Design a protein around this ligand. Sequence first.
Ligand SMILES: [Ca+2]
Length: 559
Amino acid sequence: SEWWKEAVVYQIYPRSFYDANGDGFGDLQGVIQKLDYIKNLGADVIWLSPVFDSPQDDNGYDISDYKNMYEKFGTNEDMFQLIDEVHKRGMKIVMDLVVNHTSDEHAWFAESRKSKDNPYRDYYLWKDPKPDGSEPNNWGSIFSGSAWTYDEGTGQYYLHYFSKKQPDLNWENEAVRREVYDVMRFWMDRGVDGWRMDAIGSISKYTDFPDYETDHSRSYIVGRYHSNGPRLHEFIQEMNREVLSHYDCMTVGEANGSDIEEAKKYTDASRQELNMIFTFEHMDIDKEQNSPNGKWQIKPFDLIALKKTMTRWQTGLMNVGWNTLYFENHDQPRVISRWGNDRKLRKECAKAFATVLHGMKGTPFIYQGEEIGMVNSDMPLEMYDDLEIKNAYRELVVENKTMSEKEFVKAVMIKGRDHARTPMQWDAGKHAGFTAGDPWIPVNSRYQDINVKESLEDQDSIFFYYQKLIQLRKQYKIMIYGDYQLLQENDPQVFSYLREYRGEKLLVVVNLSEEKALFEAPPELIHERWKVLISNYPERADLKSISLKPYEAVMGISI
Ligand SMILES: [Ca+2]
């Protein structure tokens, strides 16, 4: 019944969504002007990536003021208008709560770093060097190198799981927890309907700061201590009591480090923590388990791995907790370029991934441009902006030489976060109609073929297929509330599953390959009668045997 169970969320990356004022940078009035597009697609919740003041070292995820906008986005007045405009359309708005860390340019850190007696000293995590001057331990940053940076003025290191310009907050300090709760109330009292909680898995530290054990492949290590800390769930339960229980809200945690048991801790309603989380396990199927090259040590797409991972999540949260459903966000490449065909079969592939995802139990998330089949960019490496890439090149290619330049370029072309961050493609005109000026990063060179304007003129578009999926969700309660059973589990091409609710069945059959495949219903389903709800090819309704063309996707309901 809860609105968030029945929602479809559209994720905006606002610097890349619409530039209303011509500076090349997407803005809050831009978002306003495109709200009717999102409403017409059908999404009823928007998640806005962070627009708070920030020096932009990590494109807004390094916050220097939680109570004001970054000037290129607009002012608080424009934010308040956006909240009001969202509400007027019967929609909800979720903001990005970034409270594992702040910018080093936040007033709190500028103060903390001055002296050991500063009142903000213990807002962050400061530790003495080892006796040889080296770092307190061997922990690494997610953006390469050490998780510790030295401050000459006070003789201590500070912790940062992310960039050196993202010092981690000290959640052991009650003053810090109180500062966070007051930020949350400020915005929720002003109409924000919930939060996406950035790196929420990291807020509790192992306060002994133990070294990782090692066998020798790397100097700095990112591992189990970087998430799922001993006080994590205590802190989120306190957040619930102090803040979330006082509002009609939605929460989604970006649960780095999460496995299915951790997800039950976050999401079981009886624990009074969060409503849902993002996991990375389905996004992690195409990296090697633990290479020094991390995410950049790529493996080919393995459908059986995807099936097994997603099924573990569907079954684990079937009757407790709640799933998020996503393949794209501002941190992930375009799924059709990563794992499918983004050329002659692009429309069929995009619709196929959409069908697998939207037929599951949980809340779907559509990332800007996914609904039109946006693709990875062919831009050269020198055009990429992401500090993750810049830092990984220097560590992996230049310094440690654990990847060649050619290997690393290839990996970036597949997984770079910037594939998600090139401007939204509105039309075929200059800069895809994203700006009249010069965009902050180039528009994908394929935009004249892939844009909203052409999609709305094509009844076979990916857009209309997404719009139909979202309508179907609203019409067929089985899509929200049904259980889940994987079918024909061993097929290396076909992802097929069944939902059941109140005597109805929903069969989802998707060929996630470029070659022909065959689905045969299991014996218990062979005498069912079906109506086809949606297909990405022209179709019929004898779903007991389906000869599947490349990327063919079908969803049928029992009648
Ligand atoms: Ca602008």
